[PDB]
Design a binder for this molecule. Sequence first.
Ligand SMILES: NCc1c[nH]c2nc(N)[nH]c(=O)c12
Ligand SMILES: NCc1c[nH]c2nc(N)[nH]c(=O)c12
Ligand SMILES: [Zn+2]
Ligand SMILES: [Zn+2]
Lengths: 372, 372
Amino acid sequence: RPRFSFSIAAREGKARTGTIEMKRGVIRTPAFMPVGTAATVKALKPETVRATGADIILGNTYHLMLRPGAERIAKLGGLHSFMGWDRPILTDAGGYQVMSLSSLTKQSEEGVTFKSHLDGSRHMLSPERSIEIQHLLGSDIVMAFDECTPYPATPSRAASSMERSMRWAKRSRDAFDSRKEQAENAALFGIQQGSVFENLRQQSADALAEIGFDGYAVGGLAVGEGQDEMFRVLDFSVPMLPDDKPHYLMGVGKPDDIVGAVERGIDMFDCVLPTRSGRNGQAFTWDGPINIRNARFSEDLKPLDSECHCAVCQKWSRAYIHHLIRAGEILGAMLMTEHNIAFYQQLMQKIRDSISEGRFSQFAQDFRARYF
Amino acid sequence: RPRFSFSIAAREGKARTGTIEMKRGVIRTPAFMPVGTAATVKALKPETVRATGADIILGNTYHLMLRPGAERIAKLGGLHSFMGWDRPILTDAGGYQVMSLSSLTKQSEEGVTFKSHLDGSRHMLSPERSIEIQHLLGSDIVMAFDECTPYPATPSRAASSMERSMRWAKRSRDAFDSRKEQAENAALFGIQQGSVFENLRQQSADALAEIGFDGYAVGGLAVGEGQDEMFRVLDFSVPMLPDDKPHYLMGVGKPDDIVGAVERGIDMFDCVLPTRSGRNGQAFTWDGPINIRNARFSEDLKPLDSECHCAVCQKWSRAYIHHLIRAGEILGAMLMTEHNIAFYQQLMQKIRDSISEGRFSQFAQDFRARYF
Ligand SMILES: NCc1c[nH]c2nc(N)[nH]c(=O)c12
Ligand SMILES: NCc1c[nH]c2nc(N)[nH]c(=O)c12
Ligand SMILES: [Zn+2]
Ligand SMILES: [Zn+2]
């Protein structure tokens, strides 16, 4: 396979379905990427993550730089070898978790300085250091280091943060290109900023396209603005990005948000919702989410979802998983998480299939009717 | 298969190797039974428990009667169906956990009354109720309800507790037999008591044999007396039990204790050590246990054990599992537990094979040399 190749097989409105070929594997789009925070998709062996249908997972740079360390992981052979996942891995730049997980956060044009939450140690992170850490991890899709904008944001602060992000996007690009092995085996995605302002989103898209990237993320959304506003911003923001490259919406994972985002041109998604809420007792179904801890499931012999094809729904009942979760049992988290991630992959499959068959708008309509 | 059939294929000294045929499956002895406390072998799917080589698991009656309840489990189809384990399940009587997990413990000749630790509710447990609960669970090997003796114990208190246990053994036998479905599909094991006193152990063995059981457990050991004392008691206690029936040592699980116990005539074992210490960071190896949390394993690329055939040792390094455990990750517990239980099953296999080949004493000698 090539270093990176994105091809669109079918379209319907703004929605697209296709594939991204990379050295470690093929990624079917629209894609949902399970999150493996500290070198692990919580409560799941990587073979199970693959069994659910995932083509690629996401790795948190911020968490890995702290524990077990980027240099350590490189010495051990890289992230793939370390955790046992041999397919593509997209890594974020780490700055987003710094702005809300660490202390000291002394920000500047060079980068960010911070204190670790689990040690109180001192760390510096810049566009160059971020790209280097992702390289040490052996990341397949490297994210440019940016500065997120807090919601709500004034036109002035959003403009300043966006402009800085564009300068940092140029630095990330040059850093990535200067490392031969990385530029030849990995891919680099740029991140569009500009809060909820159209002119700013346009300036950001233009700067990013000028620099040139393998993919384009829509950053700064899903930060408290609500679905209506997020969708409104996507309406004018996605069309600004190069059409022939993947469009990645960062930190968006509610089933309904995914469907709406795909209708607006998004090809990639990631979120901890399926895993996090899985361990918390929330199970996704085609009839909407349910909290398995609720007493009405104590003697319910039906599977989490009546149509789900996952191993959990084939073998265990709601009553058993209800017991496991209320008893704080590890198997409860394992089962809930596997089902949720599988449900998400099945959602992506139904999306890819319906677009390929030119009946995606109807699928979205039917999905919503039943889900809500 | 028959309801119960124990056949000895080979012997060496007091050690025996053979099989127990039951309606749900065959049990190779000497056997080690993983513990599934609250309807789950902690951090493992039942298919994984089976993949490690386990022929049978143990279920805690005390925990299940509290949550989710015996009657509830019966309504749901039984324990096998409930947790997804279709092979034999041995269930304890529940009294042992009552004497050290609950409150109020008002003891009498009829049974025990207590307060649940997770609710503070009132529960009564007697030989009849215990047998009934195990029936509701759909248990394959039912344990007679007894009264354990605290270590150390005076000859007088040990005699009184043993005599009461023998009366309760008769009540358990009659209760088991009165339930047609249970007497025809399940097996009943009696429990020998008598602390560390020979004359008492003999009286207990005689009473048990008089009543007649499918198997005989050696109770009251591994309660703080030490290996030397435990072995000394087993030396004279096991020969007192009927030779043609299985000998089960309750709550004994250190690899070295197992080897010594088999040399003394024990055929069955159970303990939480492999699972409990697994989640705590202790991994068993042929070179003795190691605590994976120790810093010397942070960059150790070797598997938990150099010879282990388990899936964990085939796919992940000590460095990765070290990271997982220190990060409090669920996958850390899953991997450590699977390896430990697999290591235990491999130990039982090497024991069964060496006895079959008449070289068990040499295996025990070699095992100890390297393990210590
Ligand atoms: N929900 C938004 C989001 C999640 N992660 C992110 N990482 C970066 N660099 N930028 C972003 O905007 C975001
Ligand atoms: N270690 C001893 C032990 C564990 N579980 C037990 N259960 C019963 N009924 N009796 C016992 O002696 C024991
Ligand atoms: Zn499912
Ligand atoms: Zn192993």
